Structure 1
Amino acid sequence: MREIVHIQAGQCGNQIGAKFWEVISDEHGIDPTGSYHGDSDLQLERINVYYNEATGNKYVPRAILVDLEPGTMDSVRSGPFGQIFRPDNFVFGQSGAGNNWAKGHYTEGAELVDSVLDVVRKESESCDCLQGFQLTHSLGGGTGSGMGTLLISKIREEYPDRIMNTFSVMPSPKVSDTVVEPYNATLSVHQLVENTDETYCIDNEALYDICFRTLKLTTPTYGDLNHLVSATMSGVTTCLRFPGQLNADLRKLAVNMVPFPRLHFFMPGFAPLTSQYRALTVPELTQQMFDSKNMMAACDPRHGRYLTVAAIFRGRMSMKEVDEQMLNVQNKNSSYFVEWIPNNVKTAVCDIPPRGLKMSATFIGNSTAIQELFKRISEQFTAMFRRKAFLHWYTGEGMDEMEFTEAESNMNDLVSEYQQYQD
């Protein structure tokens, strides 16, 4: 009974969160009305980790939907599994955040935050033993970025010893909504570096390239990008939602993945990524799962070194062959794994594969190559900030330029921290 409370904030946050619950609800045999219709008891073993149980054997996600405007959450409440979410867990305003971190964090968001914490507090009170929290959101907008990080800061005040995980969508000029995205992302990363235990960095640029070059999608859409995030989110949470010879909770994952508290930003990966009925052998899964084209952070792992790596395999396959391939990838690229953390590559297998796949592989890496993602952000940030461009949108909400300088310094420090451990 190690429950997790899920929070999704803002447009991106709620659209990726919605797809996540749709996917895992399918894997746990839960229908859009909340009734179980599976065939394997494995689907209900750890079902309480993400679902509360109601009268009539109904399963209601332990999810809170947050947004400063009603648009996106109206789509969720009308979407496929919209009926499954607890009505009281839709917390939203009418003002919006105008893609402004300051509005989500200080002004518009401050007016709405307390009522979000009332629902979080309600969900936590029904948990036998709360593990921690997970937040889906983007960093380039206003609500998920600004208010999302305000939520994390106010949750830490009340649950300091719990684990706070985020799935954070990094902005990219390739798939850009506003020019202020580097401002919003830099301000958020400052919050995350100090108030999260595990952050899965999802770079929208990497997701786009995968859809264009690997999936052969001419014109990718946010829906297509979100298919990859759903799959990745289901993969990383497999060792939490299904029984196995693992017993992995959030705190144990953090203890073995995070050797330095500030270096808790992860590169997720997934395989296969087909453009489709052919069986994918274990070697193919292992070689793809480590290729850059399969990684969602748009960072070449050959540019840095892995601190820790956790690979999850799903399906019915040779666990002897699994050990043979993972030990082969390490001992054939030992120059990309730090040698001062003995046995820093671990593997876990799971019988239940994702719907419509004989077997898959999810990749979780704490690599110093993530620094290149923070470099891109820092570069785009400084290009505008050196000229105070678009700054009035933030000073008009009460922020001072000093706060921008500090967020910038901390991220460059972060980048410098990765660089020293890469040597």
Structure 2
Amino acid sequence: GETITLQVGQCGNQVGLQYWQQLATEHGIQSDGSSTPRNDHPELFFTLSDSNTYTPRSILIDMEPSVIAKSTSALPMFNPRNVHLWINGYKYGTEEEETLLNLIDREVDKCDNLSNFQLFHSVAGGTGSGVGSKMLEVISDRYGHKKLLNTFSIFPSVQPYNTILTLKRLIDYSDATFVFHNDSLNRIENGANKLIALVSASVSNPLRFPGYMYSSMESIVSNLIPTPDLKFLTSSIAPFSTQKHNYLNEYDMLLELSNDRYKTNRVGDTSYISMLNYLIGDNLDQREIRKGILKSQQRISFVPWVARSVLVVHGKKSPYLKNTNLEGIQVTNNTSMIDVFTKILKQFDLLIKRKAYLNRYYSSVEEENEVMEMFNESRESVKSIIDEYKACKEITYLDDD
């Protein structure tokens, strides 16, 4: 089925520009939307006119026109009709609810069979994070739960308040949320949006370049989310490619994809809940992959109550990329989320006991009570998810004792 991309905020718009440039390069679509000389299926991400032009399905949302202007000028094939221009931002989103609801309904009507909503946004984006938090609520309300949502939220490197307020709605409404940290991205680079764009583009490779299996997003996601509570994913990318000293075999890709240094978020000891590895090359040797799967299963520490299966998808490289060597992406579901969530909660508590900057949000007695109850609910939800991820680790998870 078709997918709709939502871009919110300055960071979201920049990441989306890199993402769409990568996708258009992979499908050979020119900057003006004209084709270049089919077995691939860009229709899932591009709308095809009866004049042979490809335009992205994405929707651009931002508080200021400079970022949107740069993005549109860089890629002229964006449709201008889809362009629209913390608590203050969220209340502003309430005012524009009708316009945005109709704007999204236009894209849904334009496609034939909708599958999922992609969202590119930054949790630490301030006002834009507020408008994206409202976007999740309105979409989930109007379209129910038949269509799932995927959020490629960028985590932060007064900010604690914003991170908690955005994470409350991220937990409530998102169906499968990727976690990216600028710290680990710049550590890997030792710009940064080119890693996120690459990971997001590769995550959907089996859909755009069909093969024997994994033809739908339901199959890709369902392998990684045993419970709707544990919805945060850790993504790992192998950087050593296109150099002379590349990984010599896909088997070494499978073994060295699990290194903790390549993960896109700060990690000690972790337990894996689910696994799925992407291998993308013109030709793939099966016996190497079998040996690598066996070693990966014998090496990785799974939680007791999970089936303990490692899945390797055999992605196909784009014809428009000339004979490049193998590359691969790893997406995992770990219990390492407790560390980052604990860090966020510690910062939030430290800055909530001290009334440092709450004057910018508490306007009156009723506003004080409103913000206090909202903050308490967000804190309780985050603690609930931490406790759930902690109870997953132990062996008595399925016991009623």
TM over 0.5: yes
Displacement after TM superposition at 1:74 (Å): 1.3
* RMSD of aligned alpha carbons: 1.9
Question: Match for 2:188 among 198, 206, 210?
Answer: 210
Aligned-partner SS, 1:83: coil
Is the Cα contact below 8 Å between 2:241 and 2:326 reproduced in 1?
no
Displacement after TM superposition at 1:389 (Å): 1.9
Displacement after TM superposition at 1:275 (Å): 9.5
For residue 325 of structure 2, what is the amino acid of its counterpart?
Answer: K
Matched, 1:55 2:50: yes
Displacement after TM superposition at 1:279 (Å): 3.8
For residue 378 of structure 1, what is the amino acid of its counterpart?
Answer: L
Question: Match for 2:262 among 282, 288, 294?
Answer: 294
For residue 314 of structure 1, what is the amino acid of its counterpart?
Answer: I
Structure 1's unaligned 5+ residue stretches are 93-100, 173-179, 213-223
For residue 171 of structure 1, what is the amino acid of its counterpart?
Answer: P
Distance in structure 2 (CA, Å) of the matches to 1:421 and 1:311: 22
Matched, 1:350 2:350: no
Question: Match for 1:308 among 274, 280, 283?
Answer: 274
For residue 29 of structure 1, what is the amino acid of its counterpart?
Answer: G
Distance in structure 1 (CA, Å) of the matches to 2:279 and 2:127: 35
Question: Match for 2:151 among 166, 170, 192?
Answer: 166
Matched, 1:193 2:171: yes
Aligned-partner SS, 1:296: coil
- The answer for the alignment partner of 2:108 in structure 1 is 124
Displacement after TM superposition at 1:247 (Å): 3.6
Aligned-partner SS, 2:296: helix
Question: Match for 1:324 among 291, 294, 314?
Answer: 291
Aligned-partner SS, 2:265: coil
Deviation digits for residues 331-365 of structure 1, max 9, x if unmatched?
Answer: 123xx212322243211011216957411111111
Aligned-partner SS, 1:402: helix
Displacement after TM superposition at 1:148 (Å): 0.7
- The answer for the alignment partner of 2:88 in structure 1 is 103
Distance in structure 2 (CA, Å) of the matches to 1:380 and 1:204: 18
For residue 34 of structure 2, what is the amino acid of its counterpart?
Answer: S
Matched, 1:372 2:339: yes
Is the Cα contact below 8 Å between 2:251 and 2:291 reproduced in 1?
no
Distance in structure 2 (CA, Å) of the matches to 1:288 and 1:113: 47
**Number of matched pairs:** 385
Identical-pair percentage:
28
Is the Cα contact below 8 Å between 1:395 and 1:401 reproduced in 2?
no
Displacement after TM superposition at 1:274 (Å): 5.6
Deviation digits for residues 174-194 of structure 1, max 9, x if unmatched?
Answer: xxxxxx222111111111111
Which protein is bigger by CA-based radius of gyration? 2
Is the Cα contact below 8 Å between 1:306 and 1:365 reproduced in 2?
yes
Matched, 1:240 2:207: yes
For residue 290 of structure 2, what is the amino acid of its counterpart?
Answer: D
- The answer for the alignment partner of 1:225 in structure 2 is 192
Structure 2's unaligned 5+ residue stretches are 395-401
Deviation digits for residues 8-57 of structure 1, max 9, x if unmatched?
Answer: 0001111101110000110011010111214xx33xx3211111111321
Distance in structure 1 (CA, Å) of the matches to 2:99 and 2:385: 33
Question: Match for 2:381 among 407, 410, 418?
Answer: 410
Deviation digits for residues 100-130 of structure 1, max 9, x if unmatched?
Answer: x212222x22233432222210010022110
Distance in structure 2 (CA, Å) of the matches to 1:85 and 1:125: 18
- The answer for the alignment partner of 1:221 in structure 2 is none
Distance in structure 2 (CA, Å) of the matches to 1:344 and 1:402: 42
Distance in structure 2 (CA, Å) of the matches to 1:270 and 1:142: 28
Aligned-partner SS, 1:164: strand
Displacement after TM superposition at 1:411 (Å): 0.8
Q: Which moved more, 1:17-26 or 1:389-398?
A: 389-398
Aligned-partner SS, 1:169: strand
TM-score with structure 1 setting the length: 0.86
Distance in structure 1 (CA, Å) of the matches to 2:309 and 2:265: 20
- The answer for the alignment partner of 1:215 in structure 2 is none
User: Given the superposition, is the C-alpha separation of residues 401 and 249 from structure 1 closer, same or farther in structure 2, using an over 3 Å criterion?
Assistant: same
Distance in structure 1 (CA, Å) of the matches to 2:352 and 2:46: 44
Displacement after TM superposition at 1:307 (Å): 1.1
- Aligned residue runs from structure 1 range 165-184, under 5 A: 165-172=150-157, 180-184=158-162
- The answer for the alignment partner of 2:398 in structure 1 is none
Is the Cα contact below 8 Å between 2:252 and 2:292 reproduced in 1?
no
- Show structure 1 runs of 4+ deviating over 6 A: none
TM-score with structure 2 setting the length: 0.91
- The answer for the alignment partner of 1:70 in structure 2 is 65
Distance in structure 1 (CA, Å) of the matches to 2:127 and 2:207: 28
User: Given the superposition, is the C-alpha separation of residues 337 and 114 from structure 1 closer, same or farther in structure 2, using an over 3 Å criterion?
Assistant: same
